Design an enzyme around this catalytic site. Structure first.
Site, mmCIF file in Angstrom:
data_model
loop_
_atom_site.group_PDB
_atom_site.id
_atom_site.type_symbol
_atom_site.label_atom_id
_atom_site.label_comp_id
_atom_site.label_asym_id
_atom_site.label_seq_id
_atom_site.Cartn_x
_atom_site.Cartn_y
_atom_site.Cartn_z
ATOM 1 N N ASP A 1 0.859 -0.898 0.173
ATOM 2 C CA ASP A 1 0.114 -0.105 0.092
ATOM 3 C C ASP A 1 0.897 1.254 0.125
ATOM 4 O OD1 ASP A 1 -2.082 1.872 0.393
ATOM 5 O OD2 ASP A 1 -2.439 1.429 2.413
ATOM 6 N N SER B 1 -0.608 15.782 -12.018
ATOM 7 C CA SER B 1 -1.181 15.255 -13.245
ATOM 8 C C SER B 1 -1.361 16.728 -14.093
ATOM 9 C CB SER B 1 -2.220 14.414 -13.412
ATOM 10 O OG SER B 1 -2.723 14.156 -14.697
#
Length: 330
Positions: A35, A199
């Site tokens: 994770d 992004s």
């Protein structure tokens, strides 16, 4: 040193991925959920409340000659999905894919929430976010990656998750055979303890690319892609009959649909998520309503590039003094 381990989807939907991990001496092999959005290595154990164990493999520290109680240390974690676990802490030898760390904090669960009990395939979590999020008290502990880092050939690990197939976690090296083209690196903020990046935008299907900054985390422990409501609405508007269902808890679509792809930007590069990656199947067994793999982040407080996005790429988690992320197509 290096390590290389295969990661395997737990079910036909890729709801999560498990990677075998050797703990203790002799080795006890547990299947952990790696994770990159948390920082605790915790396991089902001989200490876990018996009624909360249903088919998991447990770590038994008393059978490990190298296990040592970390006296006084406790841990307690809550995840984004509402799940939780807590317990006490041992140090032990932990190996992943042939890479060994001695003295790793192995957080032994005394209590786990129902979603953990109900998932027989996940024996615990191995956190790969920054050690500043580790929950051990009163002495915070380091992740497996942070303990391994100095020994590694390069201070990196890579996630190469499969679509409906096994993939690979590598530690200490970049397998130049595992991706196409070049790797595009992008800046990371460690301020919230996550692999947080920005992004450069998105496209829906064959649509034009929208240049827009989307801050979010690269989180292998999250199934879906969670993005701002504007982006998500633009995506599902291209699917006839798709709608946000408050009863189901997100966007659903007709199972008869063919989904468009979704592209996200990494600097001037582009990662394409095929439409099929966004299908999470019937909302309940036999339903003709299917659950979408791109959902709104509006109720979270952060955008999350979870497995739906990451499995479309070869992802480099660069733990150099100034961390960075890299993405390549594959």
């Amino acid at each position: 040193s290096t390590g290389s381990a295969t990661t395997t989807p737990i079910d036909s939907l890729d709801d999560a991925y498990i990677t075998p991990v050797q703990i203790g001496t002799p080795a006890q092999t547990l299947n952990l959920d790696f994770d990159t959005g948390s920082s605790d290595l915790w396991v089902f154990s001989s200490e876990t409340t018996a009624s909360e164990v249903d088919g998991q493999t447990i770590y038994t520290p008393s059978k490990s000659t190298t296990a040592k109680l970390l006296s006084g240390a406790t841990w307690s974690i809550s995840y984004g999905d509402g799940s939780s676990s807590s317990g006490d802490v041992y140090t032990d030898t932990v190996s992943v894919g042939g890479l060994t760390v001695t003295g790793q904090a192995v957080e032994s669960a005394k209590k786990v929430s129902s979603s953990f009990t109900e998932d027989s395939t996940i024996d615990g979590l191995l956190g790969l976010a920054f050690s500043t999020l580790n929950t051990v008290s009163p002495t915070q502990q380091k992740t497996f990656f942070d303990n391994a880092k100095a020994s590694l050939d390069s201070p990196v690990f890579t996630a190469d998750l499969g679509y409906h197939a096994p993939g690979t976690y590598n530690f200490g090296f970049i397998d130049t055979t595992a991706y196409t083209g070049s790797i595009t690196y992008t800046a990371v903020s460690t301020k919230q303890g996550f692999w947080e990046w920005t992004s450069t935008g998105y496209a829906v299907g064959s649509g034009t690319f929208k240049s827009t900054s989307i801050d979010g985390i690269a989180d292998t422990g999250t199934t879906l892609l969670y993005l701002p409501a504007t982006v998500v609405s633009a995506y599902w508007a291209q699917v006839s009959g798709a709608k946000s269902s408050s009863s189901v808890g997100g966007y659903v679509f007709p199972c008869s649909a063919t989904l468009p792809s979704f592209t996200f930007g990494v600097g001037s590069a582009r990662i394409v998520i095929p439409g099929d990656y966004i299908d999470f199947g019937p909302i309940s067994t036999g339903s003709s309503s299917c659950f979408g793999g791109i959902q709104s982040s509006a109720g979270i407080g952060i955008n999350i590039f979870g497995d739906v996005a990451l499995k479309a790429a070869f992802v480099v988690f660069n733990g150099a003094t100034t961390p960075t992320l890299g993405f390549a197509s594959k």
